[PDB]
Amino acid sequence: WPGKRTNLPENAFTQRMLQECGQMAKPDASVDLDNFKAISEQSPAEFGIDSCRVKAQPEDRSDRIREQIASAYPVIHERTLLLFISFLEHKLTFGSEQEKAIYKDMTVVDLVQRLLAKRCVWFFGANDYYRTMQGNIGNEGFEAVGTPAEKEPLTLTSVLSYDEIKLSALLYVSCHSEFINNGSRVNGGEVLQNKDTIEREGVVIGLIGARFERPDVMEYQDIMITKTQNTEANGYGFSETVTPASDLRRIWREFYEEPRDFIYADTPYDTTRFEEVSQGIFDHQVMRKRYAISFDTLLLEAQDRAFKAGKPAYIHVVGIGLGVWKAARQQERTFLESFEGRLRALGERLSHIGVVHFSWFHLACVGSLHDGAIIPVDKHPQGGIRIRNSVRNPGDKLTEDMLPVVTYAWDGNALPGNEFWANMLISTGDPAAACSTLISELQNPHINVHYMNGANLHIASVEHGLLHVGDYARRL
Ligand SMILES: Nc1ncnc2c1ncn2[C@@H]1O[C@H](COP(=O)(O)OP(=O)(O)OC[C@H]2O[C@H](O)[C@H](O)[C@@H]2O)[C@@H](O)[C@H]1O
Ligand SMILES: [Cl-]
Ligand SMILES: [Cl-]
Ligand code: NI
């Protein structure tokens, strides 16, 4: 899961949304480096350091940096695209007055631009410490966004709803970028005397794990089963009138192609699927599917980048969701089970994946994934995908001639780097990635405005590969 075949909904609203996608053209605005740097100096959030910025890079790197800037895009799974459409339909029918008025004329591309542009600058912790684009700082209050009890400064026109942030956890960012240092957790933006020990550049991908810190929102709604959340009143377990909550459960269940969700007392006694945790029950079957969406996007993206680079990809894989967001003891095993599954399902498509390197994992071996293993790939020019499992720094120099594809653990409601923008330069993987690359500008929708935008959305499709959304919709 997911399957290779996607089903096209026949209803007029979906057909119209796809028609509009099929009218989009790829942006091709010439990159003006001086214009970029000026935009960056006027960005609505302050940089604690400049060493990870375009302006601090050598002049002899300007040509490549211009290409890196134009190489950036947001990217979602083809199934995520259909989910976004179904979300718009659901909110236009069941949303509040506040929600209905902002989604009224919104296209798919517009919703994606909103998820990029209206996310907070930072947003971290179980109690939602935040800075909005308008500079307001506080804790909590996002549960009320987009409801008739919403209030300044957390209103739908300014910030995202938790229902939207849950969507945004499926929206990833990718670009080529200079590497400043080896990108260790504690790099803190340090500059090196020379880059003899590191790769000079590569692909950097912001992926987002599942978040369970905050009850009754995000992936907790789908994967966590608790006594207070999983009730008939909240739309679970479904001669009953449809409610907004129950309809929203249905579109997420249909996204995961699950035939039911659960009332707490109705959950089967089955430890191959369910794990008891402090909050209640953790459903590793739906967790595997949520991972599979992220991993499909990553692998199809890495394949496309590597094919255009003319060399195999070396993927630095991090445990998204397994750090400060770790929520179950078997979760890392579900992670690796899911990843092996997608490597095998995608099969011959991954001709240009060379090494998958799991960095900072506690399990040495899950299924066939252990250090030195090779997953065979039909017609792969090197016979298969090499697996590694050991700590490395993402920017370390490669002994093979391969394209480094560096993942970092991001956040659905924060700019790349997240607490980086609160001047916490050493914390989690997120500020470490911002400090050691150019993504704090190149993946920033308020700085890389011509390429990090909804109109440049790309789609990862099992059948059609990685395509700009216009090309993808036209092939449907
Ligand atoms: N010193 C280390 N060096 C490298 N990897 C490490 C280290 N310590 C832990 N890991 C592993 O690093 C991996 C990633 O752990 P995390 O960075 O917490 O990510 P998440 O997805 O759980 O939390 C994301 C949120 O935290 C940020 O604020 C974001 O913006 C979000 O708000 C795990 O395998 C860890 O075991
Ligand atoms: Cl500096
Ligand atoms: Cl050098
Ligand atoms: Ni083996």
Every domain of the chain and the residues it spans: 12-74+172-211+291-475
Q: Please work out whether the CB of residue 430 comes within 6 Å of at least one atom of ligand 1.
A: yes
Long-range contacts of 309-312 (CB under 8 A, 24+ apart): 309/403, 311/352, 311/354, 311/401, 311/402, 311/403, 312/352, 312/353, 312/354, 312/355, 312/381, 312/382, 312/400, 312/402, 312/403
Q: Please work out whether the CB of residue 202 comes within 6 Å of at least one atom of ligand 1.
A: no
- 3-class SS at 317? strand
Q: How far is CA 33 from CA 57, 203, 473, in A?
A: 12, 20, 32
Q: Please work out whether the CB of residue 394 comes within 6 Å of at least one atom of ligand 1.
A: no
Q: Whose CA is nearest to atom 19 of ligand 1?
A: 323
Tokens representing residue 344 in the block:
């095998």
Q: How far apart are CA 392 and CA 406, in angstroms?
A: 11
Q: Please work out whether the CB of residue 411 comes within 6 Å of at least one atom of ligand 1.
A: yes
Q: Which residues surround ligand 2, an ion (CB under 5 A)?
A: 49-51
Q: How far apart are CA 158 and CA 163, in angstroms?
A: 15
Q: How far is CA 106 from CA 89, 118, 337, in A?
A: 11, 14, 38
Resolution as reported, in Å = 2.0
Q: How far apart are CA 255 and CA 215, in angstroms?
A: 21
User: Is residue 274 a contact partner of residue 285, using CB atoms and an 8 Å limit?
Assistant: no
Q: How far does residue 340's CA lie from ligand 4's centre (Å)?
A: 12
CA atoms in the 13 A half-sphere facing the CB of 421: 26
Q: How far does residue 365's CA lie from ligand 1's centre (Å)?
A: 20
- If we measure between CA atoms, which residue out of 141, 159, 146, 9 comes closest to residue 84? 9
Q: Parallel, antiparallel, or unpaired: how do β-strands 172-178 and 201-207 relate?
A: antiparallel
User: Is residue 52 a contact partner of residue 140, using CB atoms and an 8 Å limit?
Assistant: no
Return the ligand 1 atom nearest residue 321 CA: 21
Q: How far apart are CA 249 and CA 263, in angstroms?
A: 12
Residue that has been written with the tokens 């992220």 in this structure = 294
Q: Which residues contact residue 272 at a Cβ distance below 8 angstroms, ignoring those fewer than 6 apart?
A: none
Q: How far is CA 283 from CA 273, 274, 289, in A?
A: 6, 5, 10
Q: How far apart are CA 133 and CA 118, in angstroms?
A: 7
Q: Please work out whether the CB of residue 325 comes within 6 Å of at least one atom of ligand 1.
A: yes
